[PDB]
Amino acid sequence: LGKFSQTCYNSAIQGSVLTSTCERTNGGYNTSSIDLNSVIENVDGSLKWQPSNFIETCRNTQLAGSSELAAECKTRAQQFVSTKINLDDHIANIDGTLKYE
Numbered sequence: 001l002g003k004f005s006q007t008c009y010n011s012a013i014q015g016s017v018l019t020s021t022c023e024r025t026n027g028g029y030n031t032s033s034i035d036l037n038s039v040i041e042n043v044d045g046s047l048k049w050q051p052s053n054f055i056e057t058c059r060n061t062q063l064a065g066s067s068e069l070a071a072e073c074k075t076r077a078q079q080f081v082s083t084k085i086n087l088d089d090h091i092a093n094i095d096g097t098l099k100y101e
Contacts, residue, residue, distance in 0.1 A: 016040075058083075067091075 005011065008022035016037040021029050041050045055061070058073035059080070067088040072080045092101050 004020065004022065008020040010031075011018065011020035013019075017033050017035050019031065019033040021031045024030055039050050039052070040047055042048075054071075054073070058071040061069065061071040064070040064084060067086055068084050069087050070082075070084040073083050074080055090100055092099055
């Protein structure tokens with residue numbers, strides 16, 4: 001996965017955004033940016049890659065009650081345990097639409 005640096009140049013980081021000029025297949029280049037805020041996180045002082053999902057390691061997701069997300073998730077030891085999280089913590093109703101905050 002990755003390896004963008006091998007075929008790009010003039011890369012730069014400003015805040016959380018990476019910008020670089022990269023080679024296209026048919027030749028030529030394109031400059032683009034990517035905001036790393038949603039894929040990298042600070043875990044106790046160390047930058048780590050953020051998981052893009054939890055459905056890959058959790059199963060049987062269910063809505064418990066009116067706002068609880070329940071599921072069986074795998075531990076580091078690869079065993080499934082019961083867990084839940086209150087969606088009311090961060091999911092709000094903004095004028096009729098569900099939004100994270």
